[PDB]
Each structure stands twice: as C-alpha cells, then as structure tokens.
C-alpha cells in the first residue's frame, strides 16, 4: 500500500514524481530549506523568494506565498514603504528582516506545497509546525 496521496501526517516528493500528476497537485512534505536560490523580491507590491528545499527523497525549487513572508517579517510591502517616512519604524523592519533570515535558517516542518508538473516548479502555501498528533499518525502508518 504506497498511494501516499493523503496518508497522514505528511508524504514524500519521490512519491509525487513517481506518480506523475496530470494537473496541479497539493501535498504535505516535512521538509527543510537547503539554500535560497534567489534575492528576496518585493516587486508586484508583494514579497516573493526562490528557495530550494528537500524532504530526503528529492530536491525542489519553491516560490513563497507572500502571506508566509509578511508574517515572517511582520511587515507587508506597503508597511515597508511607510516604515521609511519614520526611521524608527525602519529600524523595526530591518530587524523583522534578519528575523526572517533567522527563521528560514532554522525552518524545518510540514509544508503544504502546490506542485505544477508542467512549468515544473512548486509554490509553498502553508507551513504546519510538526506536533504530537502528527507523531501518532506515523506510529499507525508503521503498523504499530
């Protein structure tokens, strides 16, 4: 029994590759960021960043939903703009920014990932922090 489609607590990247999906698909891996593949962008009025992540089965280039970043930085793009008018507000941002960098350094958890098979690269939608309920999900899956 290896249809790891929705089998909790998370699934694997190689399972998804091996399945070869016809259209856009949603999974949870428990992954970590290997590197950042690009600069942090604020273009289009929102945050974006390309990292390469992994779950032990494959590597994956991901983009990041503006929602995640705003929370990690505590600042939206427009709040960033106004954090200039006031310099003390900028300071507070500059922190949120290396705070963001710290976060991504130490980031490892379940990632709701949206894989596009055609244009080949995925896009991280949520980050679930791994809890004890997930722990028991893996006990049952390993037939205990």
């Amino acid at each position: 029994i290896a249809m790891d489609l929705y089998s909790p607590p998370f699934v694997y990247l190689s399972v998804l590759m091996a399945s070869k999906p016809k259209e856009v698909t949603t999974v949870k891996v428990k992954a970590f960021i290997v590197t950042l593949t690009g600069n942090l962008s604020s273009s289009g009025g929102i945050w974006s960043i390309t990292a390469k992540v992994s779950d032990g089965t494959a590597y994956l280039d991901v983009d990041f939903v503006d929602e995640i970043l705003t929370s990690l930085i505590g600042f939206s793009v427009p709040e960033m703009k106004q954090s200039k008018k006031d310099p003390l507000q900028y300071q507070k941002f500059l922190e949120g920014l290396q705070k963001c960098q710290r976060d991504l350094i130490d980031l490892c958890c379940l990632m709701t990932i949206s894989f596009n098979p055609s244009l080949s690269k995925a896009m991280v939608l949520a980050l679930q922090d791994v809890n004890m309920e997930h722990l028991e999900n893996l006990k049952k899956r390993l037939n205990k």
């Binding site: 428990k30 032990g56 089965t57 976060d103 350094i105 130490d106 490892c108 893996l138 899956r141």
Partner: protein, 113 residues
C-alpha cells in the same frame, strides 16, 4: 545561483545505520560543540560533524543540549561516523522533533526501494 550541492537527496539516517552500513540527513542532541566541530547524540548513538566552520547560523552560538538537524557529506564511518556539514538547522524550538526523528527514518526507509 550562488550555491552548489550533491546530486542525490540527503538521506534520513541514524548513527548506527552508517556505523553498521553519500550525502545525508541526520539529527541529534548536541553533546559537545567546540569551534568548527561538534559531536551529536541521536537515539541510535553519537556522531561527529566538522565544517560548521562554513554553514549559516540563526543563533551565533552552538551549545550542548540543543537539538539540531544536519545535512552533511559522510566522511569516515569507522569507528564512529564523521560528517562534513553542508547545512544545519536548529530544532530545539520543538520538543517533538526528537520524539519523531527515530520514526521519520523508518518511514522513509519503508518508502524507498
């Protein structure tokens, strides 16, 4: 872009698994940390890592009692497995990672022929 890493994905492995049996994924409590190196403890046993010399860090200080994941290149399995750190991640935030980790490995190994 400004990056370079091994062709095949980091494998979830335990100290023992290496010690008994090239780019890997291991975790463990920090037993000793000094300069560019540190010795870790997972439920299987102990393993050394070098080259922290050159990995990114969230906190400037790697202290004993922390729990961390290492993506490393294997060095010399005998007589206790050494690693060459490529990247390292701090998991001390979450007490679960420790509990979970032993299983995380089995589950991967069931799922890859």
């Amino acid at each position: 872009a400004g990056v370079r890493l091994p062709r095949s994905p980091p494998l979830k492995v335990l100290a023992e698994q290496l010690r008994r049996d090239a780019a890997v994924w291991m975790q463990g409590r920090v037993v000793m940390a000094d300069r560019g190196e540190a010795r870790l403890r997972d439920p299987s046993g102990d393993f050394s890592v070098r080259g922290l010399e050159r990995v990114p860090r969230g906190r400037p200080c790697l202290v004993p009692g922390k729990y961390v994941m290492v993506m490393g290149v294997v060095q010399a399995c005998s007589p206790e497995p050494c690693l060459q750190a490529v990247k390292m991640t701090d998991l001390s935030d979450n007490p679960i990672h420790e509990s979970m980790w032993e299983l995380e490995v089995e589950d991967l190994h069931r799922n890859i022929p």
